[PDB]
Amino acid sequence: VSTFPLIAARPFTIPYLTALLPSEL
Amino acid sequence: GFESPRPYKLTHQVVCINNINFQRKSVVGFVELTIFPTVANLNRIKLNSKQCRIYRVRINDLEAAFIYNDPTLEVCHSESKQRNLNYFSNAYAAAVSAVDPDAGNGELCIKVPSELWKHVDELKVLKIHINFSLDQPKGGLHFVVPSVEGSMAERGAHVFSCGYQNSTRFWFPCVDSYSELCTWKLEFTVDAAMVAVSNGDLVETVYTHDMRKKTFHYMLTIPTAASNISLAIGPFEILVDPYMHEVTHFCLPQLLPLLKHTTSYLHEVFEFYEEILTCRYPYSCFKTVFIDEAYVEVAAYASMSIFSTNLLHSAMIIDETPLTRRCLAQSLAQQFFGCFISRMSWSDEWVLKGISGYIYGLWMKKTFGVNEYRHWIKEELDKIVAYELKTGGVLLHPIFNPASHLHFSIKHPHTLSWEYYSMFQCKAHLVMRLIENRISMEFMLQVFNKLLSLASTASSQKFQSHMWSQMLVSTSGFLKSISNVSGKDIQPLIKQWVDQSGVVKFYGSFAFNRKRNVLELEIKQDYTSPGTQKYVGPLKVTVQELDGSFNHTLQIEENSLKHDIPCHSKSRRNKKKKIPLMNGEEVDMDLSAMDADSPLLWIRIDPDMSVLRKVEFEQADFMWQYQLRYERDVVAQQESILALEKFPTPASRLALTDILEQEQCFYRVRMSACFCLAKIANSMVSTWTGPPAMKSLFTRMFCCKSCPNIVKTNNFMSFQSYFLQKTMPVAMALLRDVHNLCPKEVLTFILDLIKYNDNRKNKFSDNYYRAEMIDALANSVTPAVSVNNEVRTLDNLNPDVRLILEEITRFLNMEKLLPSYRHTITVSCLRAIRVLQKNGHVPSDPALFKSYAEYGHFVDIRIAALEAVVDYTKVDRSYEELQWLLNMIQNDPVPYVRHKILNMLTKNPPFTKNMESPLCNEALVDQLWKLMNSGTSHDWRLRCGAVDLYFTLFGLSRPSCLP
DSSP: OOSSOOOOOOOOSSHHHHHHSOSOO | OOOOSSSEEEEEEEEEEEEEETTTTEEEEEEEEEEEESSSOOOOEEEBOSSOEEEEEEETTEEOEEEEOOTTSSSSOTTOOOOOHHHHHHHHHHHHHHSOTTTTOOSEEEEOOGGGHHHHTTTOOEEEEEEEEESSOSSSEEEEOOSOOSOHHHHTOEEEEOOSSSOGGGTSOBOOSTTOOEEEEEEEEEETTOEEEESSEEEEEEEOTTSSEEEEEEEEEEEEOGGGOOEEEEOOEEEEOSSSSSEEEEEOTTOHHHHHHHTTSHHHHHHHHHHHSSSOOSSSOEEEEEESSOSSSEEEETTEEEEEGGGOOOTTOOSSHHHHHHHHHHHHHHIIIIIISEESSSTTHHHHHHHHHHHHHHHHHHHHHHHHHHHHHHHHHHHHHHHHHHSSOOOSSOOOOOOOSSSSOSSSGGGSOHHHHHHHHHHHHHHHHHHHHHSOHHHHHHHHHHHHHHHHHHTTOOSSSSSGGGGEEOHHHHHHHHHHHHSOOOHHHHHHHTSSOOBEEEEEEEEEETTTTEEEEEEEEOOSSTTBOOOOSEEEEEEEETTEEEEEEEEOOTTOOEEEEEOOOOTTTTTTOOEEOSSSOEEOOOTTSSOSSOOEEEEEESTTOOSSEEEEEEOOHHHHHHHHHHOSOHHHHHHHHHHGGGOOOHHHHHHHHHHHTOBTBOHHHHHHHHHHHHHHHHHTTTTOOSSOTTHHHHHHHTBOSSOSSSBOOOOOOSSSHHHHHHHHHHHHTTOOOTTSSOOHHHHHHHHHHHHTOOOSSSSSOOHHHHHHHHHHHHHTOOOOOOSTTOOOOGGGOOHHHHHHHHHHHHHHHHHHHSOOSTTHHHHHHHHHHHHHHHTTSSOOOOHHHHHHSSBTBOHHHHHHHHHHHHHHHHHSOOHHHHHHHHHHHHSOSOHHHHHHHHHHHHHSOSOOSSOOOSOOOHHHHHHHHHHHHTTSTTTSSHHHHHHHHHHHHHOSSOOSSOO
């Protein structure tokens, strides 16, 4: 946990939304 | 001439759907068919129905008796001890032929009441009123119900009809053949906040007396088949096309700006397809629906297309605009030639698939250029010759087995393997390009216009098929229309490339006779391989000599081996004059590498790809370098790149480097020259002089003039140096030091490309470039030097791989907070973690990929994680991971994911038939036989995928690892 901690993978309900959607526009 | 296999003719069908319950996943409705018997004593009427509970059937308002049996539910008996695949393929073909509406058969057998026999003998109308109910459908119509609370429109729940070919039997009873054309009346009573999209034009939309539901009435006066009828019910955002006003676009909520930008090109596709053909668009409306958890990426029905929402991009997304653009284009091509003009049998499907693919290739030629057209045609031809030399061959137009070299029956579309279906469409459009080569393109477009005009004069009559069968094309009718417009018949070309199922292999070698000034070619065919056939026609060859480019036609009969063609002067080496090219231009060539005695610079056997062929020509390396530099054909530049990997001389390095530096070369040739230069550089280690390959070229093209190691800030507005910039470190990472380890000069360069990346200034997104940077980081990973199987711990972590692991950890964690497009960096980082696990760097643990594959990560994240789990269970021989994957095949909500898991487990199998593995029990044979027999009975694509998996794992005979 001290060296190289990874944020754990959390599944979504609609994964395409978080995915395709641009965030800076 | 079309004669029906059914003894009745269907005129009109009413499909009414009530009570679409989204909580319980249930529909109720009725179906009323209007049949005219053609033979007296009709007695039983056989209709198609799957998954529908049939409540009552009334014929002419008289109660009738029906019997239902589906032989394709359990194909073989449970208590038969057969375990070979040929038995299952014959039983599955017989079961599908027993429910086939293309024969007289069907699954629901309704008995005509006795008092109507005097109404049926003198042939008068029968009105059959079935009312049915889908209780909880498996693969009939897909219910996407999210688990957010609120109303069903507030959470985004929708239904759509999924499936391929004749799969409309899965949600209402019909005559589910492409040859039973009728007019349609479609009513759908949905919620008041939802919209029901279907085929035809919406005549009205009335409210219910409580004003909580409304009924959408559609009418379809163009006679379509039951297989072309679709449905999409949801809380869709409606957008009328601002250019064409009969075209409405429906998207899921909150995706209206993406829909506005994405579907803004479609009017140009409409204008193209209506000006190369001269018919207007036959239907009165067009509707594009974008949905979630789609079956295929693009489905085309009558007057309607269903795309997935993953095609929707914004204005700042590149590398996705051409793919979505061509998906829209091929949906419109199938609107013209798969839905308006339909199929007469299951044979003559190659006609429709070929016309659709051919006019879509003409669209690609006009839109993206002739060079992109040639590159696409070459990649389709390579894909075909790879598939046909791999397994047997694709047989367009079989005659009813006609193809017994392959483990399934080709009599029905629902027994075909999915790779065979893809290669079928691919070969059909290449054979249509061949027919255009024999009979010119304007005559070809006249053939297509003649078919469309017969169909549109047919489409307006009311006679019940006296004239509605002119909307169905056959092979004989297509060849007769070709012979009508041109006066030439193509029966040798049809006999060779359609009826015969093979590609040809050419091995060529030349020798220049200096005395008689001739060029002696030597072309021999390999016709004894399993996929091959013998070519006896003419063959074009293009020879570039110093006097110019000359074409020659060679007659390659069976006993032919040596072909002497004449050669021209060499007086353009006496004086320095420019050498004229294939086009009208001429260039200065450096003739120091050429032989003194021969004038010929390069030879190309079959340049125009006029046969379905694989050429293996033996030139000299300077001829390949001249063909790479000075040719005006992209397929010849690509094949010279492909043939320069065998000659690692520094002149070939100079040729590929001059190709890479050269704008006004097609960009996909330079992207190939990157990887060719990487391979050549790996092969001439301990000879390479200066820096690693392409590094100085990258700093010359894409970095600052004052700082060589700082990359320029991202401006992706050129779209050709963007693609070259994002492909050059990916090839540069395949460089390897004499110690077989990637050099620390290229890895440091890639890490500095990652650190100094600034994207606050371009109008385009950076997700694909950063994802390719992760792919370049993954390419540099060489296998670690584990000692005595030491456990992968911090002490033995490579000092190179710690930087890579820090970067992919930073990228994946930043994707968790600021997500990209297509979670492209999630897919690239999962792929890179699997690369690090495949070598001995990260512990071989599938728990991360098993958490990303849990129903919920991007379907792209899901298929990347499942690809990693399939690779893990191949390498680690995991039993519990294979049981996890087979369980996920059996019960996953998304059927595309199930098909993709079966596809990946076929491509990367856990064991083959030759291997002894611990995973070859009788338990696994029984599980996969139960998955072929039962279990996959609801999809027709999971069952063919299970047949493919059983063939890959156990072969065509009895599973060996069994008592």
